[PDB]
Recover the amino acids of this structure.
């Protein structure tokens, strides 16, 4: 047997190696909530959240400790717990901060059940450890073309061996021609065999989206990601239709049902759920089922360690989004080989906290 | 009157003249199940199955002999038999192996019925013997461009006289540019007036299909065949809308109803039913009713002899798929003239086994 | 071989045993065109048309003789002939009188082909002679409840043995209350386990149809047939939705494609093609593929002899519509046994003209 | 008051100045049926049918005279007579030869009604005589590119003055490249100012239609007309969507409801009802209500005189189709000026027969 | 020849025999605008408008007169006039007051055109004078049941002979249950053979409409008219779906295109255009072509005289709405016989102003 004892959630703030350079402002900081579960039987559980907004950690940590109090003494069973955490907060929404806290609990609980089985997570879910093809989203923010191009060479090599086969390139400069120029410069530096995933981060309104995505539709991008506000399914459907290049969304899906509603609306060619919004491992697995049936290629967003684990059992696995923003809190991040992330043969997610860096960065 | 006595199914394995060089592996062997029907009145029936997977014959031969036992003494009437054979295995599915056994019975009993009428099959079905425009699918597997271009010269010539007006060219190499290079080499060699039908054999996921089919959309191909796994109708609907070049599927339709559902789902521009999957002659004639109503051009897959006969009475007959992989077990294969297959003036399908090649290759 | 020599069309006009009593008038005469085909090899073909409008025989007999001149010396191949005949009249329409001529030729040609094979038509089409469940449409025209009920007793009795399991009851009286009263009086006389198929013969506009079909929706009818004008598909779709009782149409389908269109539009729950409009045996078999794919129960209209043959090989065979209106000119009408029509074991349709009744009624 | 007495239909076979050179054969002859109405009040009605196939006049004349007998003594009211002609043959189809007969009657009767009112037909319908822009469909059949280019010059000039602003060009040659060459050669000769309306005459199957219409989609055609068989609404919907050039159909619409169904199916961008199929003037004015509500531009097919009249009152009037195949039997064909056809200030249609030519070409 | 000289429009305010007794207030005044046309050739035109709102006549009279000035000297051609009037006010909307002015001109102009041809309007339109089934909308306002039942006996007798076969019963009392009692009381007094058309006059919101139309759906009403505000097509679609009783709208359609949109939206089972809103005779005729293609039973609203003329040529004519509100200003209104309005054998609408009643009620 396996019984939930308590959950501890510790907020930390990390200084990015390469700060987010958007048009609106520059963001140098990256918040993380570290989550440790204890069971009566002495099996630990470890995972983390990346909630983007440092301030919101002040709402999430309390919400996590409330969930811990609620769940104390009950079976550590991810699916049961997933149902209790959501119901507890249905009155203030299944989407949003409610889901975010519930997902954090979920990943840590799955990690604990896997350790209890003495299995890597992916093995518990019915696969095995192995490689997962990945792309580098460490940077390529809205700097100058020559700066971005030089960074692109570094980001590629971060993949080891032959390098990453893809890079995420951000767009949304005041002047569209520079975005193209930046894309053209990057390919000149790293070679055209490299896949470029472009991301607008919801920066455009529909009119801007139409003109701008059309300008880049014949560039040969791997995909065009979230050009408008994430819940505009009417707009996405129009864009998907006009665009030949694959249209990518999903990082803002709050649960499998929302994915299912996006697909019924014909809103996208590709999807990439985020682990804290989709409902953790449980939400992902259900979402993989939906994506599986529609046959839509499915990628990840953030959480490279959990992502690599579930991608090993995801029917339509497409790309794993890789970045090292969370690396400092880990004793050993997963190894890279030829741009492929390697799931290590360790129980659960195989995460161990670097407590020095944690203490040096606690809030 | 005409009465079913028994049915014999004999498994053979032929050495292909040109090995199937796919991406995963090279396949040198081609399995065939020879079917001989006996009636109480002495009228024989002869047809064959081409089930691809040699191990599968050990599931199909037993299934055929069980059908033989069940049919013994009953009237040799294809439409009644098609009903009893399907009904007997409905619990283990109408589609797949069940259908395949029922389709082999069906082709052979229609052979017997046409013999009993002393009519060629096409004539019993309401047409007459004649020629059917064909294309050559003997090869053009995944070898080098210069090697495929040379092989193409030979394949066109197998058509006799002015040769085949079309060739099937397989695509799916690791590097998409080499697929294109191969098409260009082939067209240089045999001339651009030669139609090229491109087949990916379900080897791509959706994202790969979107990119690769787009790259070849302006080449001038006759059609693009099964880019993705065959039951992904949502994906096919998408590909077909985006591609200007006709999208072709159908070889994995299990029955007319499945064809009808694919057309309702807007999955394809063209269809090419396979005789062992569609329900033999009975299935084909029904799918032809469906295709005729929609106005969808209908082509064949494998079984060039049965194909030529039914194509003579198919309202939307398009292209016949010709290969000579099964020729060795026949005393006389159908003649070719300028790329048309000639249906001979013989009762039934006019097959007589070469019992030397059979014994030389029996399993 | 088998070669078309000539075709002769003789118009005859018969006094109906039970005259058509509608609201507009009383139609007492039934026209038939008797078709005889000769081949160079001495095989005959015989079939007939029931074109409803006596004077229309002056358009069809010439049309049929014109087709005989065109076909002269060509192979007697039904599928090919069906192409040729329909093609020769395409400027004056595929639907309507053109189709009626082609249909007559088609049925007779199929009869000849089957004779050539020494097989009953149904056997040639892949089935066997046997029984086909029928219902009686000889009468139950718009008379008084008392009269209709007493006639219903005789009508059930024409079935032999336990009698017809179904009767066609015509409706469309000035006072709908009397239609209902009539239906009730019939069930009172022949018993409630007798299926009543109600036919309105296109007598109503949509508002009347909405009112009257609703009034009878709960009587327990077998079906409701053509309440409005036959090409009002928008209307039929509305009626079909509002009514729970099955809605029946199709006797005015000109070809399999038109059936396809009615089904896409959602116009009906059941279909009943007429052989002179659907395209004869060739048209029926195509439409049977379409109906089979959709799963729509398929019934016949007129031509009980051809009807019984093709229903033996029609996948979704429902009811055969039986009447004795053309019996007079046949030497041996098909036998009836417990309301089933018995397809006799004779070549083709096994029709032989009763020349005494022909001369007596020739036009 | 105005009373129908009798109707006379005279079959006539003319020789075309420029013979129809198609792919399959060459038709030099053009059948006509001159129709004459007599009224008890001494007012005549004159109109003609152009039924394409000479042999079909054998069916129509008997049908026309059968309608005379039926209408004799009844009020000469076009709408009432339209109702009564259709209903009399509904059993042998609303479409096809029956509609053709009714339309001929309908045109003569509308002509009589306009004469009785002493107004040109267009004036009776609420308009006034005037010019109607036309295009020349006299030829450009399937001849040598140079032969067609030369003819195109003569054709523009038949329009008088600055000439016809549009020409019908027939496509469908064995080699599609020569179709295009012909377009380019016709333009070289008459200037790119000239609109080209391409017509395939239903000569293609769907696969041919897809390839070929795509090849000509960037040529700058005014429209592409009936590429495939006229009732294939599913195929037309696909072509319309794939093609940017407008897709024209409708010359084979039998009645206003059929146009309505085509538009619901998304079958076309432009329509061009033919007066013998659409139901004469009654049918046209109803069709114009439909096209007017959809906003679909409506053009005509054959019958330049009736055509010019109704176009004057057609809300979405587009192009008139002009040809002079019927000219010989008219004393005074309508005047041409700078491409526009001039509706004269004569009562009715203003037709008078040249009884010399009639007698010379009677049957 | 026929030329427009001037149009005079005279406001008159009558006092209804039976005052309008709605839920909100009682309305005893009925405004009419009388319209007279002068042609250069001395042919007159007479028709009237019923704008409901007395003060509106001050917007319309200046609008009609402004139209007179612009039309001065141009040909009196309804179709052409219909286009010029509508065009001149397109900047201030095609629907609404613009249309109402244009419709008044259109009816008066068609009257003149018919007079100039010495024909009744219906004869000019292809019909003949005759009877048209009518229903009585003179009263049955929101009084008590026994009062309404009493008035009903009176209203039915106004139809002469066997009486009106239909009555319009208004609903929308504060208390629904009394609406129901009123229907029964009317039926208890005039017999259940009499059709009741129920009109709510847009008086409900959707919740009330759902509840109240449902409560009366089993009463046996001829139809249910306009329960909610007239432009709520979403709501009507729902109501029409839920209600088995036919749902009637249309009196508020501004033009044939609006009817087309309503049908496309599935908004109703029946339509009843109003002549000032639909576009007079021109708009009606076009709308009749639309309605005719759909098979929608079409009825009239107000203007019994113009209505009876067009109903004689309306393919799906259903019910004529008859009331005697405008009678006082006519010398000889149309006769009734057994509930059928009689179109008299007189040129145009046969309207002549009783000028003493006009002088007596002028504004
Ligand atoms: Cl789903
Ligand atoms: Cl279908
Ligand atoms: Mg992103
Ligand atoms: Mg797209
Ligand atoms: Mg294939
Ligand atoms: Mg496509
Ligand atoms: Mg019937
Ligand atoms: Mg239903
Ligand atoms: Mg044409
Ligand atoms: Mg288009
Ligand atoms: Mg009202
Ligand atoms: Mg309803
Ligand atoms: Ni599109
Ligand atoms: Ni429903």
């Amino acid at each position: 047997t396996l019984t939930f004892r308590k959950l501890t959630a510790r907020p930390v703030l990390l200084k990015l190696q390469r700060p987010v350079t958007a048009r609106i402002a520059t963001i140098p900081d990256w918040p993380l909530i570290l989550i440790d579960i204890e069971t009566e039987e002495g099996v630990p559980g470890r995972a983390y959240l990346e909630p983007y907004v440092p301030k919101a950690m002040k709402y999430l940590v309390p919400a996590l400790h409330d969930m811990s109090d609620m769940l104390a003494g009950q079976p550590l069973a991810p699916a049961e717990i997933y149902d209790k955490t959501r119901k507890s907060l249905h009155f203030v929404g299944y989407a949003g901060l409610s889901m975010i806290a519930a997902s954090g609990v979920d990943m840590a609980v799955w990690d604990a059940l896997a350790r209890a089985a003495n299995m890597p997570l992916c093995t518990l879910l019915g696969g095995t450890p192995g490689s997962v093809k990945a792309y580098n989203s460490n940077g390529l923010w809205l700097k100058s073309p020559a700066e971005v191009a030089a960074e692109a060479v570094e980001l590629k090599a971060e993949g080891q061996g032959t390098g990453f086969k893809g890079l995420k390139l951000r767009m949304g400069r005041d002047d569209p021609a520079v975005d193209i120029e930046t894309a053209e410069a990057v390919w000149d530096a790293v070679g055209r065999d490299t896949a470029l995933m472009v991301d607008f981060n919801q920066g455009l309104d529909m009119a801007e989206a139409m003109h701008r995505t059309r300008q880049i539709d014949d560039l040969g991008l791997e995909w065009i990601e979230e050009p408008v506000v994430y819940d505009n399914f009417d707009g996405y459907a129009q864009l998907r239709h006009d665009l030949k290049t694959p249209l990518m969304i999903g990082e803002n899906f709050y649960g499998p049902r929302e994915m299912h509603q996006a697909l019924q609306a014909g809103a996208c060619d590709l999807v990439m759920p985020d682990f804290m919004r989709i409902g953790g491992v449980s939400g992902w697995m259900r979402a993989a089922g939906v994506a599986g049936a529609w046959g839509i290629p499915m990628s990840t967003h953030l959480y490279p360690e959990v992502g690599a684990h579930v991608m090993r059992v995801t029917e339509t696995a497409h790309w794993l989004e890789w970045q090292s923003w969370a690396d400092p809190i880990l004793q050993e991040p997963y190894a890279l080989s030829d741009g492929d992330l390697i799931v290590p043969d360790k129980p659960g997610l195989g995460l161990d906290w670097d407590e020095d860096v944690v203490a040096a960065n606690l809030v």
Remarks:
- The first strand of chain B starts at residue 4 and ends at 21.
- Residues A 240-241, 243-244, 247, 269 surround magnesium ion (ligand 4) (CB under 6 Å).
- Residues 97-116 of chain B form the longest helix (20 residues).
